[PDB]
Amino acid sequence: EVAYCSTYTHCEIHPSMILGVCASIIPFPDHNQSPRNTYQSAMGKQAMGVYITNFHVRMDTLAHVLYYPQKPLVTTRSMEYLRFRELPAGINSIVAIA
Amino acid sequence: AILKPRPLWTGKQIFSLIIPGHINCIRTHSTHPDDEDSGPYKHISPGDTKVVVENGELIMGILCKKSLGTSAGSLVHISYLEMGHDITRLFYSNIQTVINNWLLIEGHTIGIGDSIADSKTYQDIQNTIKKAKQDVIEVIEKAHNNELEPTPGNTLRQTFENQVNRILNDARDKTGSSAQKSLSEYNNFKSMVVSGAKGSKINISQVIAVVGQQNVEGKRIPFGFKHRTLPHFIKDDYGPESRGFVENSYLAGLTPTEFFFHAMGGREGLIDTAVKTAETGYIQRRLIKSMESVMVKYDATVRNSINQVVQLRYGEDGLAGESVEFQNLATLKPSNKAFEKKFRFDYTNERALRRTLQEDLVKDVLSNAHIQNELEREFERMREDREVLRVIFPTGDSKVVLPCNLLRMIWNAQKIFHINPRLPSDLHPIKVVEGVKELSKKLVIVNGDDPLSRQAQENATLLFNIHLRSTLCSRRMAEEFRLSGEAFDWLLGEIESKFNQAIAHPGEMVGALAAQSLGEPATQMTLNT
Amino acid sequence: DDEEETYRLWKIRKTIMQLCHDRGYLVTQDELDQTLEEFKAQFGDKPSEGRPRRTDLTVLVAHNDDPTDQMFVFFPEEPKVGIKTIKVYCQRMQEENITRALIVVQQGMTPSAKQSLVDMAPKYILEQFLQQELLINITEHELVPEHVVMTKEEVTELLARYKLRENQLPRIQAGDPVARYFGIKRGQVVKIIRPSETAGRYITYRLVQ
Amino acid sequence: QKRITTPYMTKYERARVLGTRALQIAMCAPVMVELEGETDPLLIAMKELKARKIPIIIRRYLPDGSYEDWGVDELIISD
Amino acid sequence: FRLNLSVTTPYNADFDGDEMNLHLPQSLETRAEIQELAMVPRMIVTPQ
Amino acid sequence: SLKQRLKGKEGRVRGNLMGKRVDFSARTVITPDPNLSIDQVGVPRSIA
Amino acid sequence: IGDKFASRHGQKGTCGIQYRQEDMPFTCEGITPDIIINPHAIPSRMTIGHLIECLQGKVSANKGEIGDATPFNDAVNVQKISNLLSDYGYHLRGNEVLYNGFTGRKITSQIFIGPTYYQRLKHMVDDKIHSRARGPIQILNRQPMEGRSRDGGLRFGEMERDCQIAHGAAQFLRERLFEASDPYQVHVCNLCGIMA
Amino acid sequence: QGIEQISKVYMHLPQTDNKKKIIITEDGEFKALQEWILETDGVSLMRVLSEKDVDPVRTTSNDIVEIFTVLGIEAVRKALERELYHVISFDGSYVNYRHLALLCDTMTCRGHLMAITRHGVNRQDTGPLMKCSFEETVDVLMEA
Amino acid sequence: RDGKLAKPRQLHNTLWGMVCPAETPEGHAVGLVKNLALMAYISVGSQPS
């Protein structure tokens, strides 16, 4: 076309791979203000869930375990690769803003 | 308020049961337009603005944080100053309880119907944004041609950067004007920004129209590679897309090369907060220790720990900062003809005085003549004070901090004694002169009868007496005020008590109170401007 | 040049005619507003190879309350001043019976001369200035309030009214520009009168030590 | 005479007089008002002040070493 | 600990996991001086 | 040594004479309660 | 009612009170919310990603799929989610008509309701409460010391020593530093100033 | 040309009254007049006051040790009060006047610029049991 | 961990795609510890022979 450039040498796979591990579990992260995405990535590191499947054998100190974990109803496509639907931490609740 | 088809009350009629005592206040509301108070309908409130809480009941006006929040002269402040603290406690309590219990009937929320705009608005916003981008491209091409002359004190680059910044500011202002005028009455963003509880007018613009433009180290996003910002763009490119102008909103989402820049800008703010806290925990702390040993002694002098004198009277007047208000002097500012037309108290007309006073009193004044001499002498005293004021304040302002608010204190006395301003009434003009003199004599900051001390006493209560005889002018209180004699004795008795009680207390640890007060702004302020 | 030089000598002169008027000496009225061209016609058009030699500029004044105590001011000729050069003046004071004297140093003085003036303490008190400092009256600046020196009878009225000692006052060292402009010695009390926005006027005192 | 200090009971002297008089009542001192069903030793000490009947003298120390003694009866209660 | 909101703005508090220390006056003079000097109704306006 | 024992931060003067640990103080999380006055706070029954 | 709950968009917050089901507000078919949050949390920090995943989530429970929130998709607007929701018989922006739970009356405004994904943080209140009242003390300096009950004293720092000085409270400042912490008595000679 | 300490001088005429020239007119009215000004990068006050077509009355420098060199001690009291009021009232805040007068009246009370640091307050000659809580405990105790 | 110099703490253009831009702790260690992106791969080394 009347184009920006015409000598492209490479192309990206998907521009969503520029995010870390704790920041790629946020739905629609391109709609929030920036400092908000920093807080959650330092806050989903201290959410109770099930942390490992053989928690019966390990005599760790200070282990928390949730009864009924659930997987999200609104998921990012880059959560199938870090096993967030096999060891989830949270519950889908019905929230009202009032 | 309504008694025929059905008995219906109003909100102002239930709210006027909360407001204690008989207090008087006049404020405004945040959407009071500037060109309303000039022309007609100034005492009519078509948008129901200009709060007037008269004799303890909300006559008119929409309340917001300008009238109930933390400002000076608010309704909680006036109720604190006039009634006490045991009644202001109950005032805060009763507002919060009855308004929560109505608020579960009305209800409140924020959805995303409160965060979207009609197509007519969106199309207009898109049109202007495209025009602004084209203008920047025209500026870029001419710079390559070499058709820009740098201003003195500026380089070729700095002038271009300034023009680009001005164009961006104009575009953001246009987007805000386009958005703000598409807001509805049932909206909830607008119902929070107006009421003053939370929000601001740039959040509505970033949520709805344009996020804005990021900047690290106080300037537009820098060439972090060689000649590029990210490896997607071309080298030696200076457009609005390449360097951080986020032209989408928070609801249309961000593109990747734009979410990265918004992360840079938000990162800089997070770093600033951490550094600022460390600075705050030291500078203010060091200041408190150095001036801690400063306090008010039993001589009303402010001495050190070694008793070596810092100030002869506290605050250079002798008063404590808890009980002072903003006032206006209104003698320094007007012309030499309006001053002589407002404070002269001329008896030459013989009809204006007759209209505003009792006939027997005016005729007696004219015949005594001694009275005429005294009143002309008072006008001359006022002219001398006008000159002294013109100096002390060489700039021209009139907002001066003083003790007890006098217009509110003559306006309470017009309703404790049911002053009809539609009748001539009576106030011997001399009684007013003699009363000013005696009250002026009784208030005493420096207790002394010696000549050396007498001079110090005269020097102190100086600006307050210029203000007192300025608002205590004979003419100005026999015309506009019209006050009955009984009213004057109460007006005078109270002025003295408020002043006597406003004197600073001998023993308060002033050097720490001041150090923490100085320590405050040391904290709110920017880390690097 | 000389136009710069005939300008400065008129300016520095006009400053001193006020400095000695502040200290309470008698200076004729028109000497205070001596305009430039009037100075240029009286003392000479130019000092470069001219009649104004930096001598013929000296001033001798007498006090208002007493015609005997007088003050002299000298304008040395050399850039920096030596030893007997002030003794030339010390002799000129010795002959005329005058103790109050000033010297308007041109550019500097010698450390030996610094020794030579601090010795005659009980007699022949001289004040050393600089040509640059006298070019502007600092007393008429915006920030500088109005100072007034109090007699030794008034100072004993403060310390008996506020029941103070003399150690408990705010202090000022006799080395700052206004302490020298008024010629103040240790143990004196100066009164400052400044206007403030809360009261209107406030009078504070300083002890010069 | 020569009393140079203020005739108003300052904010701090009212907080210390009420504390001391209340502690003396708790240790069985005789009261000086006709209370009616009152028991709190600090509620009584407050209505003695409203009646100007507290037997305590305040010694104000000037910063030059002098002093003067004001009877609580003679002071104008601030509140 | 439970307190009224109108008191949030002096302490600069917010209710997302803050913690607030409480001290208890022991003698009777110190309870009287806290009652007649530093109660929260007596501190509505600031000298700052 | 006796200099290092009477020295600065956490010594015997910057750490045991100016700042000291005080008994009779309890801290608990805060939550709202709009049914209270300004003058009041609500204490749990175990702290009390 | 002390525990800390947080969303997936940086909204942490404690728990204020717990109501039974007979008191929460209900919809016209008996769906009470599990959590109620303040509307003032949104406009100041601008987390609009929080308002779309509860709109997207309401379509996913009614259709039976699981939604997609990949960041830079550009194939999922709000106009495409809203038009999907009005097919199942709801308002196309999530709003609903709630009834008051105490009096059964309708609420004049319409409340925005939907399902979201919350997490339970680690900071619980059972772990942060402690109190001291005349507890064990040290041996060398006789200053209050921690005991077996986990509970020592709170430090009375330097900045707290200054708010009390500005207050003018001289008794309370003495109690907190001397009578509450290591009181002691000694004997001193009169002519000389040495202990006896 | 010029003065060696002064490196760059600007030129503008103000828009707010603060830096305009306010004159009482003949009728008695405060009038604002617009005025070109030169503002530098580098300070040497005594040569600038001594220059013709320069106002010697209203020259002001934000360097308070240089005003302490040139004008006096009361000028640093008042210029210091004006500088604290200039940094507090830039974000639209408001601190009362008693506090700025007490700080600027304690900082310049003994004659010279008592800086609020270690080296200004620790020269104050208080008693011996106050200086020992301040960085030099055993040395103060042994000289005392 | 306490130096006030901002240039080793601010986000640099060259971190595109190799270090996460949003994830970092607050406090005194802002921008000092960082997490790497999803597909970022660190090399292991070889011989230039």
Ligand SMILES: [Mg+2]
């Ligand atoms: Mg918080």
Ligand SMILES: [Zn+2]
């Ligand atoms: Zn002995």
